[PDB]
Amino acid sequence: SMRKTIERLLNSELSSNSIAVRTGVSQAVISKLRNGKKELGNLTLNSAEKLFEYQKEMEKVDTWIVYRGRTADMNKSYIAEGSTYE
Amino acid sequence: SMRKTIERLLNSELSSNSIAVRTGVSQAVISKLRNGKKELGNLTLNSAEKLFEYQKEMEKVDTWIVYRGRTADMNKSYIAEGSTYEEVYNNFVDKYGYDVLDEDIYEIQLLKKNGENLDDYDVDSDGINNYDKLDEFRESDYVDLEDYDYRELFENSSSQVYYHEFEITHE
Amino acid sequence: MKRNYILGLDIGITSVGYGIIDYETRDVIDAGVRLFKEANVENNEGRRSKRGARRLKRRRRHRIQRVKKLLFDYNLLTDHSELSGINPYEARVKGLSQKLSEEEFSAALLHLAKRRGVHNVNEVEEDTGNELSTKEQISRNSKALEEKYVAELQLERLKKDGEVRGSINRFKTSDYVKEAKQLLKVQKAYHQLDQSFIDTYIDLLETRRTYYEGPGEGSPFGWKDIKEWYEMLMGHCTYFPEELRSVKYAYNADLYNALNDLNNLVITRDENEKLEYYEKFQIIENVFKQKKKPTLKQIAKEILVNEEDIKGYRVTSTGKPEFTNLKVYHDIKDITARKEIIENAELLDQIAKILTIYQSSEDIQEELTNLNSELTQEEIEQISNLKGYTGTHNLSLKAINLILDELWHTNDNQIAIFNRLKLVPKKVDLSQQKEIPTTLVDDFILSPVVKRSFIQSIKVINAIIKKYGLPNDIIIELAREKNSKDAQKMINEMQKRNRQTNERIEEIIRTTGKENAKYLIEKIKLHDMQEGKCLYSLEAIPLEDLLNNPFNYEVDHIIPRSVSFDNSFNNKVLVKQEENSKKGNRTPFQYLSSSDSKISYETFKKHILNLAKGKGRISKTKKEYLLEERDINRFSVQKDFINRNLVDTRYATRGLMNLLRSYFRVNNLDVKVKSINGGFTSFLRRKWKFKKERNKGYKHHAEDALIIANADFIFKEWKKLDKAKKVMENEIETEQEYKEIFITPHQIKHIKDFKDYKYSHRVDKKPNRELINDTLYSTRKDDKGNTLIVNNLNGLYDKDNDKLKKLINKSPEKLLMYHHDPQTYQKLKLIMEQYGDEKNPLYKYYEETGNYLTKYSKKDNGPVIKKIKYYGNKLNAHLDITDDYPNSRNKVVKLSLKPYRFDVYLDNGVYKFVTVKNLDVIKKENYYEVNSKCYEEAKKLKKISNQAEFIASFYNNDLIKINGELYRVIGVNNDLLNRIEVNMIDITYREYLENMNDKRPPRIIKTIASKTQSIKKYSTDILGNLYEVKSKKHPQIIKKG
RNA sequence: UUUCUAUUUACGUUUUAGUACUCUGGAAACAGAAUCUACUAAAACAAGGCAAAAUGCCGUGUUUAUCUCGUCAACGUUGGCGAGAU
DNA sequence: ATAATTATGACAAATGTCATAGAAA
DNA sequence: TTTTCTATGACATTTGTCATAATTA
Known part of the structure; x- marks a missing residue:
């Protein structure tokens, strides 16, 4: 539960309720953290891990994907590549 | 504060009180986590970051290898220590000098590892005696020693350091 | 001539750098560094x-x-x-x-x-x-x-x-x-x-012979009888010459150390912070006579005050408070507790001296028996088995009583007692001596590295005084490292710490997604130590906000630098610009007391104390600086800060300072000598931006010394710190004033540009240094007529030693067994092939059969085999000792004849040299003389005519000039091939290779046999001037030694 | 701040000698051979220098530019002293 | 309308930071 | 002797969970 990454989620433009739904942590706790009524240090490791895991997914940018497709006989091969699966 | 690393410190042989003094956390909590009366998840990030920072240093274990070498009579003792065996050789040739180990041992091992025949270079008690040829071999890109053979460099010298005993500490 | 100058010293462990600065123009008359092989x-x-x-x-x-x-x-x-x-x-x-x-x-x-x-x-x-x-x-x-x-x-x-x-x-x-x-x-x-x-x-x-009888008659390391034994084991006290030094575990000296600690303690109370005579007596009696190991809590309980108010005590490496205990007194009370024994200082002292000097218990009990005391026979047997009393040289008892009397009556410490009493060494009369005498350095108990460094430094001072006249001021820095084994340990630990911080920084850069962390390392280190909490207002601080808006936070100093003199991270904090502006050049105590802060002082203290214990993020000195309630305006408090941060306090620096001050005072020379802490020169190096690299060679030990001298000149151009100088030699300003005073890089470019850095090395003429490496290798004769050394394989059964394996597969014919006893080789081979996979097949054989490899026998009654001998290499240089071993069928030799010196001759226009080996310097009484017969044999072996002109003789580290390139001889490598070994004068070759990233071998070896146009001898004085030396026409035969 | 000394034990590297081992001649007594591997005694263990039946004694550490003047000492060269120079 | 989001609680059950207890060596 | 070892708990405070009441476009 890196303090810096959890800090990025709390300072993100993502909604407190929206973060809460995905994290599973209460919107109340998220709001009181942004309010400062609560401190990140006093947070249970379980809750801290959930916030850290949720923030990790957003750092999936810069991906490059290649498609190798073989015809049923494994003989003729079709290959294409691009930034997003689209 | 990765749960796995804290789980590793809890599973360590270090005394609950020993970790507490170093981390600043209470022996009570560490002992209760180990007993299982307390869940690592329920711990605060503040206290867990402390236990995590402790493990970090232990996780990256740094081996310290201390060379104790006694002269044949067991009377005069030579001792050097360093991080990788290569460091042990480099300290022993600085503090106590090269002429303590057998003459020209570093060169002889390098030539042997590359695969050259030692006899051609006239290996002697003084060691490489055909300096002219050694210089040519050095010119060729030699294959360097692998930090597991500096031990061999120390244990193939009996001129003065007859009894050699290496102690390796991991922490 | 007569030129006012400031002298600076950098006294390392392997070098002593000296620098000269003009008193007026910040000029540099001369710089240099004396070198010497590390004492061990x-x-x-x-x-x-x-x-x-x-x-x-x-x-x-x-x-x-x-x-x-x-x-x-x-x-x-x-x-x-x-x-x-x-x-x-x-x-x-x-x-x-x-x-x-x-x-x-x-x-x-x-x-x-x-x-x-x-x-x-x-x-x-x-x-x-x-x-x-x-x-x-x-x-x-x-x-x-x-x-x-x-x-x-x-x-x-x-x-x-x-x-x-x-x-x-x-x-x-x-x-x-x-x-x-x-x-x-x-x-x-x-x-x-x-x-x-x-x-x-x-x-x-x-x-x-008992340990108190020594060698017999005529020995330089002997003594006539037991009174002389006390004199030799104890020695005459330098402070009072006729009185002998006493033991360290003795009760009176224990009382002195304990009273030092008690006087040092500061307790925040309505009374004086330093304890006075009566309550000092009460505390010493109760605490140090009722409990074996005193603790701070016991003190707080007995004086019935808060332990939170006690500051200024020595601490162990683990953070536990440390108080020196009356070990001998508690040891007495453990066995017997009668009044007649424990309240007699002389009896307790004598008991301690006997336990410390007499190792054998039988002697101890007899010596207490001869002492007409109140001890009973049954108690003496128990007391005689006490242990751990092992300190021999400690301050004399007569002086210990005088110091204890002043300590009881007044709240002073040892250093100022010594200054007040003006105790001066009296072993050697300082008045008669023309130059500082190196004898005094022997007495102070200093490690041999420090002793050698002190002797070399004193000789450098003598030479500089003789050359450039009397130095107006001397500044002496002793380096932090005690010995090399510590320089590596520290460098390794620092590397590890640097790696962990780099791991924090790189992870932060990725998580933030910004490169601001590259210049934000100082603040980000402070953030987690404060746990993102402004120590002045308690408000929580986001790490991301520090990267996004670095100007919203600043690195403030807890104590003003005009007094603290501390610039370490311990004296740094991350605070709100408004908090720093309101705080000013004051202390956190009065500021949290003031209404400007948005938190109360007591809550601040509570948060600081709990934070210090938690995660080990607040250092011991950090909380003391934060909670410094005593006013900095007081002269004693500013002096205390100077001593803890700017004046060295280790015994070694003090002793050298006291010796030099006594010498200058006795001769009535107006010479002020002063010391500088190790971190201060590092800070002044950092702020003048001179730390480009540490591998430019030895010139580093000179440059630092120069900076040291420059410190004096910046402690007299400004009156603001002038009083502090008077404190060091024996108002309150803000931090930007401190930067104005010290950062200013004017006339400091001289250190950057000076290139004539004289260097010197210590010649080592000592004869009898060592003769032959000791391992009496035996030899055999092979078929080709040569002679081979027979090294012996040992520890065959050990798990990690695979030598037998490697030799067996690569070259079986080398084991003596192959030919002299074949069958047993067959057994060894069958074993090696079957269990070959293991690193050590013999160990795996032992782990399954439980039998060592026995010699082959028809009855299987053969002996074990633990050493197998093998032919090794040929014999080139050897001190043949075969004459000592009678009727030896094979020769017995020793290797590596250590060379003493080499003499160069110019015969028929070509330069040769003859190596005077150390074995040829026989010793007759005081004089050491070169064996004429062996020297003549060696001279003839080199094909030298009888009219060959003599050029020079080189010992170790004498400067040689071969074909115009200067070098320092380390010693001849091989005499037969005419190869000598030289390492460059300025930078050790190993370093010269790294600054070029070359991979050539580390020892320059040069050849004098032919194509050697010139071999001149240069020599350098302790300062470092280079004067070509014209030697005598006959090689030296008798060295006085 | 922890150096400088002090006495002692067992080992240990080596040679010789002996007893086992290995081998050949050979029925072998034994004769040898080989000197390899284990023990066992004795001897040497920095080159050596004193000393003279002594609970004997020194030899791997500290201190070190070189040349010179004179002074003094050991003994001519070294000292040591001083005073210079390079 | 209406839904997602934003602020405060209540409460059972923990936690950090201090002890002590008894043991163990 | 005595001095750290685990274990257990006290206490003031804070959690996590599970609510509301409001809010705005």
């Missing part, structure tokens, strides 16, 4: 352990000789008699009964004598590498020797185990004496013996 305790442990051996060998030989002479007297042993075939063990057992023939008897007596065994069981001084301690071994042997004498046990071991020698044959002298007298009582009934002979033989068998 080991070498002296070498000479001493060996001396200790030669002596054991000499005493054994002398006892054998005396017994042989005695047996000639009674006609039992005669020159004609042959003692060759008699077996010692079988004869001792027979003679314990029956009769012994004249030979067998002689063999047995000579035999016991060769080996008497230990006397004081614990007297032994050795490591437990044998896995069986000496005391436990004697205990087991005695438990086995209840009804059997020594000979019986040894013979039984030889017949059953097959061995006698080893670590199992360590006995006690009493059993040997019993066996000797038992056999003699029987054998005297058949041969002509008298009780005088019996007593003489028993005496010779058990005689031994």
Whole structure:
């Protein structure tokens, strides 16, 4: 539960309720953290891990994907590549 | 504060009180986590970051290898220590000098590892005696020693350091 | 001539750099560095352990000789008699009964004598590498020797185990004496013996020199009797010459150390912060006489105040508070608690001295018995078994009483007591001496590295005084590292810390997604230490906000730098710009007391104390700086800060400072000498931006020294710190004023541009330095007529030693076994092939069969094989000692003749040299003289004519000039091939290779045999001037030594 | 701040000698051979230098530019002293 | 309308930071 | 002796969970 990454989620433009739904942590706790009524240090490791895991997914940018497709006989091969699966 | 690393410190042989003094956390909590009366998840990030920072240093274990070498009579003792065996050789040739180990041992091992025949270079008690040829071999890109053979460099010298005993500490 | 100048010293562990600065113009008259090979305790442990051996060998030989002479007297042993075939063990057992023939008897007596065994069981001084301690071994042997004498046990071991020698044959002298007298009582009934002979033989068998008798007559390391023994072991006290130094664990000196700690303690109370005579007596009595190990909590309870108010005490490495305890007094109370013993200072002192000097308990009990005290006989036996009293040289008792009296009455500390009393060393009269005397450095107890550095530094001072006149000011820095083993440990630890911080920084850069962390390392280090909490307002601080808006937070100093003189991260914090602006050049105490802060002082203290304990993020000094309630305006408090941060306090620097100050005061020379802390020069290096690199060679030890001298000039151009100078030699400003005072890089570019950095090295003419590496390798003769050294493979059965394997597969013909005994090679090979996978096939064989590799036998009764000998290499240089070993079929040689010096000759236009080896310098009394015959033989071996002109003679580190490139000789590599070894004068070659990233081998080796146009000799004085040396026309034969 | 000394034990590297080992001649007594591997005694264990039946004694550490003047000492060269120079 | 989001609680059950207890060596 | 070892708990405070009441486009 890196303090810096959890800090990025709390300072993100993502909604407190929206973060809460995905994290599973209460919107109340998220709001009181942004309010400062609560401190990140006093947070249970379980809750801290959930916030850290949720923030990790957003750092999936810069991906490059290649498609190798073989015809049923494994003989003729079709290959294409691009930034997003689209 | 990765749960796995804290789980590793809890599973360590270090005394609950020993970790507490170093981390600043209470022996009570560490002992209760180990007993299982307390869940690592329920711990605060503040206290867990402390236990995590402790493990970090232990996780990256740094081996310290201390060379104790006694002269044949067991009377005069030579001792050097360093991080990788290569460091042990480099300290022993600085503090106590090269002429303590057998003459020209570093060169002889390098030539042997590359695969050259030692006899051609006239290996002697003084060691490489055909300096002219050694210089040519050095010119060729030699294959360097692998930090597991500096031990061999120390244990193939009996001129003065007859009894050699290496102690390796991991922490 | 006469030029006012400031002198600066950088006294390292392997160098002493000196620098000269103009008093007026910040100029640089001369810089340099004296060098010397690192002193090591080991070498002296070498000479001493060996001396200790030669002596054991000499005493054994002398006892054998005396017994042989005695047996000639009674006609039992005669020159004609042959003692060759008699077996010692079988004869001792027979003679314990029956009769012994004249030979067998002689063999047995000579035999016991060769080996008497230990006397004081614990007297032994050795490591437990044998896995069986000496005391436990004697205990087991005695438990086995209840009804059997020594000979019986040894013979039984030889017949059953097959061995006698080893670590199992360590006995006690009493059993040997019993066996000797038992056999003699029987054998005297058949041969002509008298009780005088019996007593003489028993005496010779058990005689031994006690530790307080020393060597015999005529020894330089001896003493006439026991009073002289006290004098030698204790030594005359430097402070009062006629009085001898006392022991350290003695009660009075314990009281002195404890009172030092008690005086140092500061307690925040309505009374004075320093404790006064009456409550000091109360605390010392109660705490240090009722509890074995005093703690801070006990002090707080007895004075009934808060432990939170106690500051200024020594702390252990683990953070536990440390208080020196009256160990001897509690040890007394443990056994006996009567009043008559514990309140007698002289009795307790004498008890301590006896326990410390007399190692043997039997001597201790006797010495207390001779002391007419109130001790009872039963109590003396128990007190005699006390241990851990092992300090010999400590301040004299007469001076200890004087210091204790002043300590009791006043709240002062030792340093200022010494200044007030003006105690001056009196071992050597400073008035008569023309130059600072290097003798005084011997007395202070300093490690040999520091002693050598001090002697070299004093010689540098003498040379500079003789050359450029009297120095107006001297600044002395002793470097932090105690010895090299610490320089590496520290460098390794620092590297590890740097790596962990780099790991934090790189992870932060990725998580933030910004590169701001690259210049934000100082703040980000502070953030987690404060846990993102403004220490002045308690408000939580986001790490991301610090990267996004670095200007919203600033690195403020807890204490103003005009007094704190501390610029470490301990004195730095991350605070709100408004908090720093409101705080000013003041202390956090009065500011949190003031209404400007948005938090109360008590809550601040509570948060600081809990934070300090948690996560070890607040250092010990950090909370003291934060909670410094005492006003900085007080002169004593500013002085305390200067001493803790700017003035060195280690014993070594002080002793050198006191010696120099006493010398300058006695001669009435207006010379101010001052010291600088190790971190201050690092800070002043950092802020003047001189730290480009640390591998430019030795010129680093010079440059730092220059900066040191510059410090003096910046402590007199500004009156704001001028008073502080008067404090160091013996108002309050903001931090930007501090930057204005110290950062200013004007006339400091001179250190950057100066290039004439003279260097010098210490020539080592000492003769008898060492002769031949000791390992008496045997030799054999091969088919081709050469001679091969026979190295022996050892520890074959050990798990990690794979030598046998590698040799077997690569070259079997090298094991002597291959030809002299073939069958056994077949057994070894079959074993190596089957279990070849393991690193050590022999260990795996032992792990499955449980048998060592026995020699091949038809009956399978062969002995074990633990050493296999193998031909190794050919023989080139050797000190042939074969003459000592009689009738040797094969030669016996030693290797690596250590060269003493080499003399260069110019014959027929070509330069050759003859190596005067150390073996050719024979010693007659005081003088050391070069063996003429061996020198002539070596000269003729080099094909040198008798009219060859003599050029020079080079010892170690004498400067040589070959073909125009200067070098320093380390010693000749191979004489036959005419190769000498030189390392460059400025930077050690190993470093010269790294600054070019070259991979050439590390030792420059140059050849003088041919194509050598010039071989001149240059020499350099302790300062470092380079003067070409014109030597004498005959090589030196007699060195006074 | 922890150096400088002090006494002692067992080992240990080596040679010789002996007993086992290996081998050949050979029925072998033994004769040898080989000197390899284990024990066992004795001897040497920095080159050596004193000393003279002594609980004997020194030899791997500290201190070190070189040349010179004179002074003094050991003994001519080294000292040591001083005073210079390079 | 309406839904997602934003602020405060209540409460059972923990936690950090201090002890002590008894043991163990 | 005595001095750290685990274990257990006290207490003031804070959690996590599970609510509301409001809010705005």
